[PDB]
């Protein structure tokens, strides 16, 4: 039953993802708890964000054909397209990444099997842009 509602909310999440971006066809993977950090170069250390929640990797019916979002447990989400300017570095249970703006990030995973699996998935769908 806990998983019935689980399946349910993954159905509703897809749909919510779609109302904000309709090129979206399906969720490729999701995780339990993840939390977002950003790197501050000036101060030279990591800094917490207000972002913490569930991570969804989804496919799109148009380039960029992949994206990922952290739906926050306030209402400010992380949204990130999977293009070739995205680069990753895995340091379990953290997943570091840089994007087009050159801003630096770390996704901490609670479950380190999620960390490995998503890291692998990303690497696959970065090789495909």
């Amino acid at each position: 039953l806990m998983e019935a509602l689980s399946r349910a909310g993954q159905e509703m999440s897809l749909a919510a993802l779609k109302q904000h971006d309709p090129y979206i066809t399906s969720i490729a993977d999701l995780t339990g708890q993840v939390a977002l950090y950003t790197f501050c170069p000036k101060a030279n250390q990591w800094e917490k964000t207000d972002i913490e929640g569930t991570l969804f990797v989804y496919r799109r019916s148009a380039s960029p054909y992949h994206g990922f979002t952290i739906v926050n447990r306030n209402m400010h989400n992380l949204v990130e397209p999977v293009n070739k300017d995205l680069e990753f570095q895995l340091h379990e249970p953290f997943l570091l990444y840089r994007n087009a703006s050159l801003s630096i990030y770390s996704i901490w995973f609670y479950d380190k099997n999620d960390c490995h699996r998503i890291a692998k998935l990303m690497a696959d769908v970065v090789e495909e842009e």
């Binding site: 939390a35 250390q45 990591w46 570091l96 050159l102 630096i104 901490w108």
Partner: peptide, 14 residues
């Protein structure tokens, strides 16, 4: 959720 004491990013990213 770890204190902001994660590992450093690849040197070349900075």
């Amino acid at each position: 959720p770890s204190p902001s004491v994660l590992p450093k990013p690849p040197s070349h990213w900075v």
